[PDB]
Design a protein around this ligand. Structure first.
Ligand SMILES: C[C@H](O)COCC(CO)(COC[C@@H](C)O)COC[C@@H](C)O
Ligand SMILES: C[C@H](O)COC[C@H](C)O
Ligand SMILES: [Cl-]
Length: 113
């Protein structure tokens, strides 16, 4: 598949961290694709045109779908944005998203040049 670039190695590290036990208390809703029918959110796919979640990001990284760090970051941010779009701003899951996004943005900002 070829070695990830230095920047994508950093991205992969961030991704592993987002999936790790120490963040699980707020990361878990983002682990897998939203199963709209299971949750009874029958409007989800009308509102969210481009679903994204951490398992999908992981598969894309493994498959070398991301050609650079920017493409990776856009997907992670899309995942958070979908949460902010679908849910009311006082929802517990929105607070979880904000916390995980803090983890993400601060470490993404430490990207090697
Ligand atoms: C503390 C609990 O209320 C957290 O609920 C999460 C869930 C239920 O497991 C899944 O959220 C997935 C994110 C990606 O939106 C909230 O589900 C409602 C819509 C899908 O957000
Ligand atoms: C909570 C906002 O949607 C995302 O903020 C990220 C910042 C690094 O805390
Ligand atoms: Cl972006």
């Amino acid at each position: 598949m070829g070695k990830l670039s230095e920047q994508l190695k950093h991205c992969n590290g961030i991704l592993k961290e987002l999936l790790s036990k120490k963040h699980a208390a707020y990361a878990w809703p983002f682990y897998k694709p939203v199963d709209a029918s299971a949750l009874g959110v029958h409007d989800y796919h009308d509102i969210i045109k481009h679903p994204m979640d951490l398992s999908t990001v992981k598969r894309k990284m493994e498959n070398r779908d991301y050609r650079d760090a920017q493409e990776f970051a856009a997907d992670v941010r899309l995942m958070f944005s979908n949460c902010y779009k679908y849910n009311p701003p006082d929802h517990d899951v929105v607070a979880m998203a904000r916390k995980l996004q803090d983890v993400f943005e601060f470490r993404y900002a430490k990207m090697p040049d």
